[PDB]
Amino acid sequence: SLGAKPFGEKKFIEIKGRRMAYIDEGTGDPILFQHGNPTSSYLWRNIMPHCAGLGRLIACDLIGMGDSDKLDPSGPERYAYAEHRDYLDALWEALDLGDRVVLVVHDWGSVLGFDWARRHRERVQGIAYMEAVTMPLEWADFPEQDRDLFQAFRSQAGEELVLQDNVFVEQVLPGLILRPLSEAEMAAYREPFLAAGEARRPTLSWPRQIPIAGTPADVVAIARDYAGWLSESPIPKLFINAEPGHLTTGRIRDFCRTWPNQTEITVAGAHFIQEDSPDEIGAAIAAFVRRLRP
Numbered sequence: 054s055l056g057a058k059p060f061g062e063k064k065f066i067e068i069k070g071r072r073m074a075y076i077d078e079g080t081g082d083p084i085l086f087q088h089g090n091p092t093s094s095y096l097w098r099n100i101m102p103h104c105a106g107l108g109r110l111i112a113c114d115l116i117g118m119g120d121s122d123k124l125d126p127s128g129p130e131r132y133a134y135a136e137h138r139d140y141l142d143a144l145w146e147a148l149d150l151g152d153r154v155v156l157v158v159h160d161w162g163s164v165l166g167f168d169w170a171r172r173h174r175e176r177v178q179g180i181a182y183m184e185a186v187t188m189p190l191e192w193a194d195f196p197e198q199d200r201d202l203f204q205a206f207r208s209q210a211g212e213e214l215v216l217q218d219n220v221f222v223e224q225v226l227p228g229l230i231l232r233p234l235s236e237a238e239m240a241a242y243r244e245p246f247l248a249a250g251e252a253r254r255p256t257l258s259w260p261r262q263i264p265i266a267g268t269p270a271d272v273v274a275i276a277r278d279y280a281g282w283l284s285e286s287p288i289p290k291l292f293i294n295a296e297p298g299h300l301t302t303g304r305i306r307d308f309c310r311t312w313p314n315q316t317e318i319t320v321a322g323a324h325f326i327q328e329d330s331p332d333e334i335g336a337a338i339a340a341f342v343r344r345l346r347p
């Protein structure tokens with residue numbers, strides 16, 4: 054169902070001298086849920102219950118996000134993709150995931166998850182993805198009404214928009230969910246980001262890292278790498294398409310629809326589709342996992 058209550062209890066682990074927070078419930082092979090910007094493990098709260106008893110249910114808060122520690126000192130050079138990956142790689146190593154992981158990814162969680170999967174192909178049993186970065190982007194893939202705002206994040210105006218005014222959390226997030234959020238739901242999303250300034254840096258560093266029109270060159274290459282790999286990998290896949298959807302439409306959806314061994318369903322939603330169709334998403338992922346783990 055819908056609901057504002059989180060799934061399980063937050064656990065904490067020391068990684069590269071910082072505390073990272075994660076949910077880890079049940080036993081068996083992991084079903085690993087990865088949020089992106091500006092969200093947290095909370096994004097998956099009404100989806101994870103659908104996988105009850107199908108394995109070990111895990112949702113990690115990225116560094117600087119959810120209940121995970123802020124980097125100190127933070128600044129414009131902090132929270133780049135490479136830095137997030139170092140912390141997540143280390144957390145995933147520490148969680149002892151074994152070699153039959155099912156990944157469930159969204160947004161920046163898809164860039165991180167697709168990259169990890171390419172680098173650890175032998176350990177990946179299945180990949181479920183939605184509203185994901187399926188390949189390097191051009192401004193033309195970028196939803197038309199988002200172009201000016203994201204270009205602004207990727208300019209000097211970004212600090213005032215995000216660090217001062219919390220635009221990603223307060224405007225982009227509800228703007229890309231079709232149903233109205235409750236007070237409690239917004240409270241959960243704004244909590245990691247209540248303080249103006251560097252506390253909000255991850256939500257600004259992320260839009261600056263999106264691989265668009267060749268920049269930044271390092272994230273473009275990582276995305277180019279996994280796009281080529283996924284288009285050839287026989288690993289089973291579940292593509293959860295959205296209507297109207299947002300990011301994974303047009304060219305980049307045309308692209309991910311060429312991926313082998315893929316089941317697709319369509320659900321209602323824009324970008325943060327977890328808030329619009331949690332039960333349909335959860336049911337689809339559960340069915341996917343059941344078939345992978347008969």
Ligand SMILES: [Ca+2]
Binds near residue numbers: 227229230233
């Ligand atoms: Ca809305």
Ligand SMILES: [Cl-]
Binds near residue numbers: 152
């Ligand atoms: Cl095993």
Ligand SMILES: [Cl-]
Binds near residue numbers: 090259260261263
């Ligand atoms: Cl972003």
